């Protein structure tokens, strides 16, 4: 794709290190600060159940595909202004590759 695809062992530690404080990926997994990210890909932004999303995350309604997802992670507030996810973003393509790839796989 336009987005490459990378190491999923790496993506894994990046996720455990940078996203885990707020998010789970396992199925049924509990929302935290952030929604449970299971079956993220293929869903529209703002759909996780029994999680309260800023109207901004709902009103953007984008399908989460590895591509719009990568633009998002680079800078969550530029992408969905008003979003309340407090992340600075991943400025590194590998990182983005490595993570997405991991996610791809973890949120099946």
């Amino acid at each position: 794709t336009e987005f490459k695809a990378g190491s999923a062992k790496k993506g894994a530690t990046l996720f455990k290190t940078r996203c885990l404080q707020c998010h789970t990926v396992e199925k049924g997994g509990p929302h935290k600060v952030g929604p449970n990210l299971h079956g993220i890909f293929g869903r529209h932004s703002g759909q996780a159940e029994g999680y309260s999303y800023t109207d901004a995350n709902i009103k953007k309604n984008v399908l989460w595909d590895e591509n719009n997802m990568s633009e998002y992670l680079t800078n969550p507030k530029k992408y969905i202004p008003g979003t309340k996810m407090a992340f600075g973003g991943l400025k590194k393509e590998k990182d983005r590759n490595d993570l997405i790839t991991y996610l791809k796989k973890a949120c099946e």
Partner: protein
Amino acid sequence: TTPLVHVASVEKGRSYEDFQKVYNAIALKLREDDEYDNYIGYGPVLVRLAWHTSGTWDKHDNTGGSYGGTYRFKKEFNDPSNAGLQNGFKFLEPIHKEFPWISSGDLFSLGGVTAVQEMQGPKIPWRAGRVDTPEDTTPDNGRLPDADKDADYVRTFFQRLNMNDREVVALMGAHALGKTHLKNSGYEGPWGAANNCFTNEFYLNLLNEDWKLEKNDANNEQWDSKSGYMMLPTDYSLIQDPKYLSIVKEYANDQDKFFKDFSKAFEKLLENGITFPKDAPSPFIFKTLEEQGL
């Protein structure tokens, strides 16, 4: 029988004029030996010294704190958390020799007060009376904060010093001063450009710079901006946490407010663990050199 109490006892005949003389001595040396750390001068390391010697306090059993002046003993002197503080200690040695009657804790704390005032910061009322205690009273290393942590860690850490959100955010504004040095802490760079002037620049930079999380030469991560400034993970947590962010914003937009709160919190920091007799003198507010036409 039971738990430690530390009573403030100011040496006989020693009064305000005496301590003002010590303040002047420090302020003068601060001007004379101005080349230190690429001309930032010794002001910042003196403030960090007052904080590290007071920050060992544990409100639960009254161990540590500025009272005993135990940093003079091996164990604390070599606490890795104190790397670089030997510089402030050396700066103060000659001062202590000229004024042998002042206690160690009184000198370390007065050094921080003098440095803040001489760098144009707020007046910090100060109280004399700390008394040197034996080596056995030296706390073990491990009581100072890790910088690679988050807001929750900062909040719970400062609870041990009896500090609240407001006090924590205000005290952190001291990072306007000096810089991190890779050889000392594994972090490198200044938080701002006015390294030896006490302002609210810390909060302004936190809110106005574009920060990028990056690894440094020691393999630790820090937040860096294009201007060449940095923020430790714990500094940046102040805008990651909502409660802290609101206070950051108010200091960024009102320096007089920051000054007043910092003054109160820094004195409290400096006096934690100390029981002052009810007949004890009102805190002293030393005149700066500028205020002496000097």
